[PDB]
Each structure stands twice: as structure tokens, then as C-alpha cells.
Amino acid sequence: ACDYTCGSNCYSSSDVSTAQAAGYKLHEDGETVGSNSYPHKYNNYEGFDFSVSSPYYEWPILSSGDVYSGGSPGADRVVFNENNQLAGVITHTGASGNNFVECT
Ligand SMILES: Nc1nc2c(ncn2[C@@H]2O[C@H](CO)[C@@H](O)[C@H]2OP(=O)(O)O)c(=O)[nH]1
């Protein structure tokens, strides 16, 4: 099947894990990439049902499979906390404005 379905993109367990690990590491080293400085704090304005503690950080997960390196981030994001716990996988696809919806 598809573990995480973002809009029309499909990500597996290891895809999310690989992306999350990349973002978490940059977070640890205080590093960011891209015009929007990823990874950066995700305040959860959407009020998603996160079962892990804040603070949260969003990081792009690419449909292609490459680890984000500051280029075009696309619409999908993995969200993790300081414990490197996956808070969830969200996307701009299906949402209005600069809002998000959870990939299912
Ligand atoms: N939609 C949304 N934007 C957030 C959230 N937390 C931080 N932001 C940031 O707040 C601003 C307005 O939405 C943007 O800079 C956005 O960054 P991103 O565009 O990288 O998501 C959140 O929970 N939801």
C-alpha cells in the first residue's frame, strides 16, 4: 500500500524515517536550509491531534526520495519534536492558504 498518503504522493515508513532523521540532525546542529529555513518550529495552528510533546519542527519530505537540501520543498512535511519523536506527517495539498492537512 502507501504508509503515508500526502495529496497524491506516497511515502513509506523508511521514507519518513530517513527524512525525519535528516531534519532532526540539522536541528541538533542549529543548521537550516532553503528560503524558508528548514527545519523550523511548527506551532501547530491547525490544532492537530499530536500525542507527543512539543516543541515541534517541520521538515520537507520529498516525493522524489532525496533528502531536502535547500531546494524546492514541495508541499509535504514530517513533524518531529526534541526527542526526535514523529509528531505526524502533514501537507499543504488539500489545504487552503498556507495551512496544512495530515497525510493519511
Ligand atoms: N500553517 C502553519 N504555519 C506555521 C505553523 N507553525 C509555524 N508556521 C509558520 O508561520 C508562518 C505562517 O503560516 C509561516 O512562516 C509558517 O512556516 P511554513 O510556511 O514554513 O509552514 C503551523 O502550525 N501551521
- Given 27, 46, 58, 82, the catalytic residue: 58
3-state SS class at 1? coil
Select from 42, 44, 101 the residue to mutate for testing ligand 1; criterion: most ligand atoms less than 8 Å from CB. 42
Q: How far apart are CA 54 and CA 75, in angstroms?
A: 22
Sheet with 40-42, edge to edge strand ranges:
40-42, 56-60, 76-81, 86-91, 101-102
Concerning whether 58 is annotated as a catalytic residue, the answer is yes
User: 69 to each of 59, 64, 72, 74, how far by Cα in Å?
Assistant: 11, 13, 9, 12
Experimental method: X-ray
What's phi and psi for 7, nearest 5 deg?
60, -105
* Residue whose C-alpha is closest to residue 46's, from 104, 100, 103: 100
Half-sphere exposure of 47 (CA within 13 A, CB side): 0
Residue spans of the domains in the chain: they are 1-104
* The CATH classification of domain 1-104, taken from the options 3.90.180.10, 3.90.380.10, 3.40.50.10860, 3.10.450.30: 3.10.450.30
Nearest ligand 1 atom to the CA of 100 is: 1
Q: Whose CA is nearest to atom 8 of ligand 1?
A: 42
Cell numbers found for residue 64: 522524489
Cell numbers found for residue 16: 519518513
Q: For residue 72, what are the contacts with CB-CB under 8 A and spacing of at least 6?
A: none
* Stated resolution in angstroms: 1.6
